[PDB]
Design a protein around this ligand. Structure first.
Ligand code: MG
Ligand code: MG
Ligand code: MG
Lengths: 545, 545
C-alpha cells in the first residue's frame, strides 16, 4: 500500500469523464514522428489512452487494416471473432474494427446485443470453429486487461486460438505504423451502417456454447453435488454475463456480490498506488470481496479480459503461485485421460513448489522462459496439460486432453477451485497448507537493481560459465542457466539454483534496471541472503561493460 | 406512477452504454431528407440522440456555424459563454462547438477544468458581462434538460441573457439544415488542439462569481442566522459544484445527500413511466430524496440544466403551482426596493391561486401565453419582478430590481424557499396550506385526446364569440379568450373562465392531439364538470376538418 487511499472506495474525483475520453478518441490524433504515439503492438497487442494520443481512431483503423491484410496473406479465409471488454475505449475501437474488416470483405462474428467477451471465450470460439475443418477462424480481443478506466487495448489471436507471436505482431506493428505515416492511405473503411448492412457482421451468442462446454473441462456435476456456497465479484469485467449464466445453467449457489458495469469503474476500491485497476490478485483492489469472505466457502474474481483469476477463502486472497501449485497437484491426479505424453509447463520465475509437486507425481516438467507464449503450441497439441504464469494467468486442457483455450482462461481456473473443494472436501488454500507442510513453505520476492543500458544488454547475452560463484546463500550452486531447461529457449538473462533456493535476473523493459526474482524454501531470512548475493553476483558478471 | 418499477432504484439493465453512445455521435450520420433526423432548433434549442441519428457531429457542426453567422449579423462581437451539463453527449457537442466557433474567430469563454455550468449561470454571466457596456456577450448551453441519459441538446441565449426567440431560432434551424443538405461545405472548422492554441478559448471559474452574487438576490444572512438543517440532491446535474460552494461560502448546514456524477445516472430512481429522467418535480424520480425528507427542515433538487427546482419538506414534494404562489406572495412583501409598478408574470395555464395572491397584494398581474419566453424582456428591463411556469421553472429580480438571470434559475428558487423558512419561521408548504385555508384548495387537471392536423389547426385560430355558451359548470362565463389578457398575444387556443374555475384548450405542439387544462376552486366534482363541458365546447368549435 503506497497511496493513502489504497484499499478505499474510489471517490468521484478519481473518475474519468467517459464521454470526453471517447470523444478524444476521435478528436485527438497521434503526433507524426512522435514515438510515444506510435503503434506498439506486442505480446498483449497495442495499449494506450485517447487522452495521451496513444489510443485513437487512427491507431485502430491502421491496426485493423494491417490485421486484415496479414490474415489474408496467411490463408485465413474464415470468420474473425471480435470480442471486447467493458473499457470505455473498447466501444469506439470495436466500431473501427468493424468498419475496416467489413470494408476488406472479412466476415466478422460478434457477441449479439453489443455484449462483452472474455479473451478465453474468443480463444475457445476459434478452436471450436477450427475443429470443424473448414476455412480457418481467428480473432481480435479489444481489451487493455486490468489497466485503468482511461486505457484501451487491442490484440490478435491467430487460428491456433493463442496470442499472436512476434512473427505476426512485428509485421502488423510495422504495417500499422507505415499506414499512420501515410495518413491512412491504404486503409479500407466503410461507415458503421454500411458495415452492418454489408452482410459481413454476424451477431451470435458466444456465452451459451462456452458455458455449456465447461462440463467438458471442469467437473461441473461434482460441483453441483457438493452444494457449496460460492461468491464472485465480476469486477465490472467482460465475463459478468458468463458468471450469471454459469450459476443459472448449472443451478449453482453462486452469488454475484455486485452486478455493476460502469465505464468509470467507480464501485472499485483503489489499488496500492491509488489507481483504479481491476487486478483480481491485488489485495487492495480486492478489498470489497475480501470484506465478504466469511459469507462463502469459496469466492473469486477476474480481471476485465477474464484471462486471470483471484481465489478467495475465509483465510483471504490466495497468492497466485500458491494456487498454481495446487491446481497442478490436483489436475494431474484427477485427469485419467492425460496420459504419460502430457506434461506440466512452468515458467522459470515461478515457484519451485511446482517442481516438487510435479516430481512427486512422476510427471514431466517443462521449464520455459517468462511469458505465456511458450505454452501455446503444447496446449494446442495436447502435450502440455497445464501452463501458467506467476502473475495469476493459466490454462489447461479439456478432460480428453484436447485444448479448451490456448490463451489464458480465468473462468476455468476459478471453477477448478470449486471442483477441487467439491471433490476433495478441502478448499485450495487448505491444499497449499498441506503442500507447505510436506515440502516447506517457500518465501518469494521480486526486486530490482539499477543498471545502465550497456549492462542491461550484456545481461541478455551471458553464458553459464561467466558466473564463477560456486555458492549461493550457504549452499552449492546446482545450476547456472541462461537458457530454459524445458525448451532450450534463451531466457534473456540468468538463473542460479541451489537445492534450497534460486534467483533469476532479467533486464527491465521499461526502466534503467534489471529485475530479480528469487525464492527460498528455508524462509524469509535465507531469501534475504539470496537477494544480497544475487546483486553481488550480477554486479560481478556485468561489471566489465 | 404507471410503470411497475416507477420509483424504484435503476437496475443495470436500465442503463446506457456511454462510450458506445458517444462513438455513435461520430460514426452515425443523419439521413438526407429524413425529417426525424433534421435539426429542430426551437424554444429549447435542438435535442435528440446520437443512436437515433438526431444528435451527431454533423448537427452540432452545422448549428455552431449557423450561430457564428447569426450573432455576427446581429451585432455581437464580444465573447460567447459556452456551458455544458452532465449528459454524455454534451461532451462531443461541446468540442464541436469550440472547433467551429474558434474557426469563425469567435472568442469563447468556458468553465475551466472541463466543468459543468447551469443555464442560469450562463444567463447571469451574459448579464454581468453586458452590464459593463462593451462588445456584447451571448451564450450557448449544451443540455437537453431532464431528458434521459441517451439524449443531448444545444440552445442559444442572445445578449439579453434569455432563450433565443423564433426570429433567431428559425434562421439558425434553416441555416443548419441547409448546411447538412450541402454536406457541411460552408462549416468552418479547426482541430480541438488548434482551437485551444488559437487564443480564442478562455477557461475561467464561473462558479465563484455566481455563488458570491447570490447575496444580491437572496437573503443569505437571514438563512445563515436561522441555522436550518438543509438537504440537497444535486441529481448528478450541472450545478453540483454550485451547491458545494454555496454550502462552504455561506457556511450553511447544507448536506448533499449524494455527490454522484455518472453519465448513466444509475443512482436515480425510475420515473413514473420507468424511464431514467432527472425531473426534480416528479415524486417517482425524487423517491431517493423523499425517503430522507424527515431528516431536513427543507430539502431540494434541480434538473440537469439547473433551471428548474423541486422543494421538499417533511410533508413531501411540493406541487410546482403551489410553490409559485407562495414564492410570489412572499417576494412581493419582502422586496421593499422593487417599484410599486414591478409586475408578476403568469402563464396561461398556471393556477388561479396566483391571481388571488397578486390581487391581494395589489400588484400588477401579467398573464401571458404558455412559455417562459414571454417573461424575458420584462425581467431584463426590471418591469417583471417574477416570471414562472407551471412546469417548475422561474426567475426573479435582484434586491435592487435589476435582473439576475433572464433564463429560468433553479438555484435561486431553491434558496428562496430557505429564505422564506428563515424569515417567516414557516416552510413554503405551511404557507400554501394557509393560502388554501383562505381561498380554497383548487383542483387542477390536464386532459389529452387525439385530433387530426386540421382540427388542431382550427383550435389555434378561433375567435372568442365562437363560444356561444353563457355558463361553464353552473357559473356564468366571465371571459372567453383567444389572446392572453396580460400581453395581448395569441394563445393559439382557447381559455374560458368563471369566478370559480377555468379551462384552456390548446393543440399539442408535437402530436396529433389537443390538451385541456382546467382548475376549480370548488373541488374535484366541479372540476370534473368543467372537464366535461370543456370537451363539449372544444368538440363543437372543432366541427369541421
Ligand atoms: Mg488480463
Ligand atoms: Mg430544465
Ligand atoms: Mg426577444
Amino acid at each position: 500500500a503506497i497511496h493513502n487511499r489504497a484499499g478505499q472506495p474510489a471517490q468521484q474525483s478519481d473518475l474519468i469523464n467517459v464521454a470526453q475520453l471517447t470523444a478524444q478518441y476521435y478528436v485527438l490524433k497521434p503526433e507524426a514522428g512522435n514515438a510515444e504515439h506510435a503503434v506498439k503492438f506486442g505480446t498483449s497487442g497495442h495499449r494506450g489512452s485517447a487522452g495521451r494520443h496513444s489510443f485513437n481512431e487512427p491507431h485502430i483503423l491502421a491496426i485493423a487494416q494491417a490485421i486484415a491484410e496479414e490474415r489474408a496473406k496467411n490463408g485465413i479465409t474464415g470468420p474473425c471473432y471480435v470480442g471486447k471488454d467493458t473499457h470505455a475505449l473498447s466501444e469506439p475501437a470495436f466500431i473501427s474494427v468493424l468498419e475496416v474488416l467489413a470494408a476488406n470483405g472479412v466476415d466478422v462474428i460478434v457477441q449479439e446485443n453489443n455484449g462483452f467477451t472474455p479473451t478465453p471465450a474468443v480463444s475457445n470460439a476459434i478452436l471450436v470453429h477450427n475443429k470443424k475443418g473448414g476455412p480457418l477462424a481467428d480473432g481480435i480481443v479489444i481489451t487493455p486487461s486490468h489497466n485503468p478506466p482511461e486505457d484501451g487495448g487491442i490484440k490478435y489471436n491467430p487460428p491456433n486460438g493463442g496470442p499472436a507471436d512476434t512473427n505476426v505482431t512485428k509485421v502488423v506493428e510495422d504495417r500499422a505504423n507505415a499506414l499512420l505515416a501515410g495518413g491512412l492511405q491504404g486503409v479500407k473503411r466503410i461507415s458503421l451502417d454500411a458495415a452492418m448492412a454489408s452482410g459481413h457482421v454476424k451477431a451470435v451468442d458466444l456465452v451459451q456454447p462456452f458455458v455449456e462446454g465447461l462440463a467438458d473441462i471442469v467437473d461441473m456435476a461434482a460441483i453441483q453435488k457438493a452444494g457449496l456456497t460460492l461468491g464472485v465479484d465480476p469486477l465490472g469485467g467482460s465475463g459478468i454475463e458468463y458468471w450469471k449464466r454459469i450459476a443459472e445453467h448449472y443451478k449453482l449457489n453462486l452469488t454475484l456480490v455486485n452486478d455493476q458495469v460502469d465505464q468509470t469503474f467507480r464501485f472499485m476500491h483503489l489499488d496500492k498506488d491509488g489507481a483504479i485497476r481491476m487486478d483480481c490478485s491485488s489485495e487492495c483492489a480486492m478489498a470489497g470481496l475480501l470484506a465478504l469472505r466469511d459469507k462463502f466457502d469459496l469466492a473469486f474474481a477476474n480481471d476485465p479480459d477474464y484471462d486471470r483469476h483471484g481465489i478467495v477463502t475465509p483465510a483471504g486472497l490466495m497468492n497466485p503461485n500458491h494456487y498454481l501449485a495446487v491446481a497442478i497437484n490436483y489436475l494431474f491426479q484427477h485427469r485419467p485421460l492425460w496420459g504419460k505424453d502430457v506434461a506440466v509447463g512452468k515458467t522459470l520465475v515461478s515457484s519451485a513448489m511446482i517442481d516438487r509437486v510435479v516430481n512427486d507425481l512422476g510427471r514431466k516438467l517443462v521449464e520455459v522462459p517468462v511469458g505465456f507464449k511458450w505454452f501455446v503450441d503444447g496446449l494446442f497439441d495436447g502435450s502440455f496439460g497445464f501452463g501458467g504464469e506467476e502473475s495469476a494467468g493459466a490454462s489447461f486442457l479439456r478432460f480428453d486432453g484436447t485444448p479448451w483455450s490456448t490463451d489464458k482462461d480465468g473462468i476455468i481456473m476459478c471453477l477448478l477451485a470449486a471442483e477441487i473443494t467439491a471433490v476433495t472436501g478441502k478448499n485450495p488454500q487448505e491444499h497449499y497448507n498441506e503442500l507447505a507442510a510436506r515440502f516447506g513453505a517457500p518465501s518469494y520476492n521480486r526486486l530490482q537493481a539499477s543498471a545502465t543500458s550497456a549492462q542491461k544488454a550484456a545481461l541478455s547475452k551471458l553464458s553459464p560459465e561467466m558466473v564463477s560463484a560456486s555458492t549461493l546463500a550457504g549452499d552449492p550452486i546446482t545450476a547456472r542457466l541462461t537458457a530454459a531447461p524445458g525448451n532450450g529457449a534463451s531466457i534473456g538473462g540468468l538463473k542460479v539454483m541451489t537445492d534450497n533456493g534460486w534467483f533469476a535476473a532479467r533486464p527491465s523493459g521499461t526502466e534503467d534496471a534489471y529485475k530479480i526474482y528469487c525464492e527460498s524454501f528455508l524462509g524469509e531470512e535465507h531469501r534475504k541472503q539470496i537477494e544480497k548475493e544475487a546483486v553481488e553476483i550480477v554486479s560481478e558478471v556485468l561489471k566489465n561493460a
